[PDB]
Every structure is written in C-alpha cells, then in structure tokens.
C-alpha cells in the first residue's frame, strides 16, 4: 500500500517506471577528512542532481530508490531538495557498507561493549518508523552489503538486525554483493532469520557471469537486480556484453518477475574531484544514468524481449516488491 | 619561534606547560552513520570541551596539542571555539589514522588512481600553510599513525608525504603507535626520508613494557611520548603501574630532554553515547586530564624526580620541538 519517501508517504500505487538502484551522492568513507581541497558545493551539487533526476524524467523514470549507505555520505534532506523540485519520488536507505569500503571502526567498537547489533536495530527501527536525524524523513529501504567470498562477523550484525527490523516493520531489504560472490549465501541468512524473499533484492547479481549462481540465487524467491550496468572493466567487473547475454538467458527461462535493472550511477561525488585514468575511462564511458534507455533496452529489444517483459521489470516488479 | 595555534600564530615562547597529546573531540569512523541516534550536541560539547580545558589550567597547563586525525572528526573551528573562551592554546594537526580504525577507503581509492600520495602531500601543505576548509586555522603539526607490528603500505604514503611536508615546512611530526609496535621502524623511516628527528614524536611508546625498545627508538634522537597515562585494561594497554617503572628507569638513564607525558584522553565522544562493562571501567577510571597532575607526577616526586626533570618534560621538551 505505502512507502515512505524523501518527501513522505506516497502509494506505491504511483511509484510507476523505476530505476532500483542509483546514487545522487557517493563518498568513500575518509571524504570527509579530505575537506580542504574536497568540500561539499551546496549548490552546485544540487544543479547536478536535479540535472540528473531530469535526464531520467525523459525516459520516464518516476521513482528511483537511492541506497547510499548511513556511511558512504547518505543525505537524506539533500535528496528531498532534488524530489521537491523534480517531482521525482525518491527512496532513501537505512544501512552501513561492507566491510571492506565501509567504515567499520564505529560498530566494531560497540561490539566490543555487546550492544552493537541491538544498537543497529534500534538505528534501523528509528530511521524506518521516526526519522532520520531530524530531518523528517524515513528510510523506505534496509541497505545491507556483504564482502567479498565472505559474510563477515561485522555485516552478519547487520543482516540480523535486518530481519528483526523487516519483521516489525516489513521494510524492503536491498543487498550489495561484492565481485559476484555471496547472492545465494545473503539469501539464505536473510530467510535463517525470518525475512521475507518477496521483500528482499539481492544486489549486483549481474556481477556474476554463471547462470546457474543466479538460478540458485533464484530459487529462494528472491528479486535479484542487474544494477550496474555501464560499470566495466573497473572493479572485477564482467562487461555489459555478459550483462546482457546472462540477462537474456534468465528472460527467455522465464525469470522476469524476479529481475531489476539500473546502474548504481554516483552522479555527484564526495570528497576531491577526479578523473579517471584512460584505460578505465574509455571502458567506463557508458555509466550515466541515460545508458540503460538509450543503449540496453534497444538491444534487448532487437533480441526480441518484449515490452511487457521490460514494463514487469521497470514497473510491475518494483510495485510488487514494495507493496 | 612561531607555531600554528587555533587561534593563529603563538610564539614558542609562551606555549609554556604543555600536554603533548589529548583529544577534546574524538569519533571512530562510522559515527557519521550513527547520527540519528548520535547527532553532536554543539552547545554541551563545548560546554564539556571548555570544561575540560579549565581543569588543565588548574594545574598549570597553557598548552595543548590535539592531534585527532583529519578521519576522525577533528573539527578545528570548535577547537576554536575552547580556545577562545579559554585562552588556552590549542595546537591541532592535518593527518590520518592508521589502516586498522580510520576510514581507508578514501585514499585508497586515490592510490588506485595514482594520485594518493601527491594528494595527501598537498593536504598536508595547503593545511599547514594556507588553512583548513575556510576556517582560516592552520594545523600546527602533522599526525601520523601504524598498524600492529606494521608500517602498511596505505600507512607508508602518509609517512612519505610527511616527511615531504615538513622538510617544505619544518612542522612537527606526532605519532600514533598500535600496541606497542613499530616505534623504532616510524623512526628510521622517516628519518631515510629527511625527517628531522627534533621535530618528530613517537607516540604511545608507554605501551610498551621493554626499556630496550624505547632505547632503541630513542637512538634516532627523536622524542617518544607517554602520553597514554590512565587507560589501561583496554586494547592491549600495560598499566599506569609499568608505565611509572618504565619512564623511572628512562629518567634515571638520562632520558628527559626527549620524553613528554601526557592522557590521550577523548573528552566529548562523537556519536552514541555509551558506557563501558565493570571489568573494564574501574582500570579506566583513572583516565582523566586531571590524572598526570594529582596522581603520576606526586608518585614519581616520591621516587625523587625532581622538579627540574617535570619542568624539562612539561616545559622545556615542548618548546625545544616547536622551536
Ligand atoms: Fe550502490
Ligand atoms: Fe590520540
Ligand atoms: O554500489
Ligand atoms: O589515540
Ligand atoms: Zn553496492
Ligand atoms: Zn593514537
């Protein structure tokens, strides 16, 4: 029935075409000791992410879910500036990073007190029914990410207070799987625990290039999200070539009731402004928030893929997963 | 002659008492994540900064170096703010933690990029020379920090650039070392890189317990620091007990022209508040500013350190290194 958003409850009834996964800003944790020569411009940021949420307005895009992680420089006011001048529905994430790019020092700390999984929770419980911070708004999404080949002692807090959390409050959960590796593992932990697979996304599943990890990612009834297309070459990636070839083995096997698309794009970085080196630069090229419209679909379109089966996965799936 | 303060220029002349190493501020990375249930309380934080600083003024103190890294939550406009009120002299630094709890993400992103090392070069100059952020405050030493039993190669760039700055620069070096670790190894490293051993204080060199391993730093001609006194139980710490055995046999040895002393104490915890298990809160009890003042320094006068010794390590050494 609802969801909440930047800018408050909305049905999700009208949540319509929807990307699934992007970032407006990103930082690595350490931005922010970096202030000097890497400050936050208001402003123009704000010219920049409006821009953005335009851009997708022109393919049709109406909602987009934003997972930045509490740690990699969430700002969820930021957010609701771009909804309140785009008219653009915006969910916003409850979550911290892996291990391995979070910033782990905090909650490893409360662990050694005993307190930080019940710290969490009550972080995810606040957040998801009260507000965060004291800016009104409520998370619409649980945001959790595992490492890589590996569920960490760390992340395993998290994924717990997950499930208590989607247990009292029925919060979608929306996972970051790292390198291809752990979908089915974060599938099943989440279940061990009582979550519930019709409210859950695993993460960069296109990451994974071998059907058989997405069918056995599958099988728990799970959504699973091909939400990083135009990232290639950096970062263990495989290319948007394999995306699309393991992409269309899943549609025409019948799986499109359970498979998103976006790009997980960062429109506005945090921190020092940098340029990509050559090699990254060319490969990378087609990472923007335009590329699955202008260059995805017509391809799966020429491959036949109807466009009933692109309107369940932009509209249908979101729909049933949050409602 | 002149040294950065926060509240600018202060010749070394009349930094007169002085703690080597306290935190007014200090948070884990990740607190950021946790604002909604631990937003920072602006006015009661300097309410208990000022506080803390009239304490040490009680007992002689003009002068306090605060070294919290840049990934840490140093905020130097409200160190600003204590000095102001307080007329206390505030030195702060530019620098960040060592790998195992401070937010490496960022930088190593850069290191990817290839530009790390040159961008924290330039950190540490526009911070020393030019300011930090827009609040026209120049950090007045550069922290460094290591891993246990480790100088990383994440660790390693801080220290070149270091070593780079302050022969551009000749500020001061203060330290960070993990559990008793790498004392001597900060020493030669950056001493093979142009350091200036007078201008260079390794920290946390109370942790360990073997007068060969201070010898052993102490050969370079820097300063070491024991400037943990009162936190023991925790973290691998050795009591305040051995730290007193340990600086008796250095003193006796003739030592004194390069040890100072001090707490490392956190004042205002950013993030949630918490509270610490029975175990480890009553060998913690004693970690307080006050705690060199009313409880070490009359033990080590009752082991005949005499008067001009304390007045070397509190007075003298300070001036020396700023000079
Ligand atoms: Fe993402
Ligand atoms: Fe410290
Ligand atoms: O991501
Ligand atoms: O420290
Ligand atoms: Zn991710
Ligand atoms: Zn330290």
């Not at 990073?97 to 606040?126: H, N, V, W």
């Not at 695993?202 to 069918?215: A, E, F, K, L, S």
């Not at 359970?258 to 990378?284: C, K, Y």
Request: proline share 5%.
């Amino acid at each position: 029935e609802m969801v909440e958003t930047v800018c408050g409850p909305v049905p999700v009834e009208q949540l319509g075409k929807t990307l699934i996964h992007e970032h407006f800003l990103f930082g690595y944790p350490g931005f922010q000791g970096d202030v000097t020569r890497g400050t936050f411009r208001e402003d123009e940021s704000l010219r920049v992410a409006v821009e953005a949420a335009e851009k997708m307005k022109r393919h049709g895009i109406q909602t987009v879910v934003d997972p930045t992680p509490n740690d990699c420089g969430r700002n969820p006011a930021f957010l609701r500036r771009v909804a309140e001048e785009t008219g653009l529905n915006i969910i916003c994430a409850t979550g911290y990073y892996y291990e391995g790019e979070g910033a782990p020092p905090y909650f490893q700390f409360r662990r050694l007190l005993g307190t930080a999984e019940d710290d969490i929770y009550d972080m995810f419980m606040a957040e998801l029914t009260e507000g965060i911070a004291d800016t009104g708004i409520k998370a619409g999404v649980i945001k959790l990410a595992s490492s890589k080949g590996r569920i960490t002692e760390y992340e395993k807090m998290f994924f717990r207070a997950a499930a208590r959390a989607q247990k009292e409050t029925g919060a979608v959960i929306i996972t970051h799987t790292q390198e291809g590796t752990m979908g089915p593992e974060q599938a099943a932990y989440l279940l061990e625990h009582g979550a519930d697979p019709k409210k859950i996304v695993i993460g960069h599943m296109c990451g994974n290039t071998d059907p058989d990890y997405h069918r056995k990612t599958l099988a728990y009834g799970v959504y699973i999200a091909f939400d990083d297309f135009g990232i290639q070459g950096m970062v263990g990636a495989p290319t948007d070539e394999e995306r699309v070839r393991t992409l269309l083995a899943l549609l025409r096997d019948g799986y499109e009731k359970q498979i998103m698309l976006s790009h997980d794009t960062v429109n506005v970085w945090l921190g020092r402004p940098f340029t990509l080196p050559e090699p990254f630069a060319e490969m990378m090229k087609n990472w923007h928030v335009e590329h699955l419209f202008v260059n995805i679909i017509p391809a799966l379109k020429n491959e036949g893929i109807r466009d009933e089966v692109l309107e369940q996965m932009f509209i249908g799936n979101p729909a049933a997963l949050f409602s």
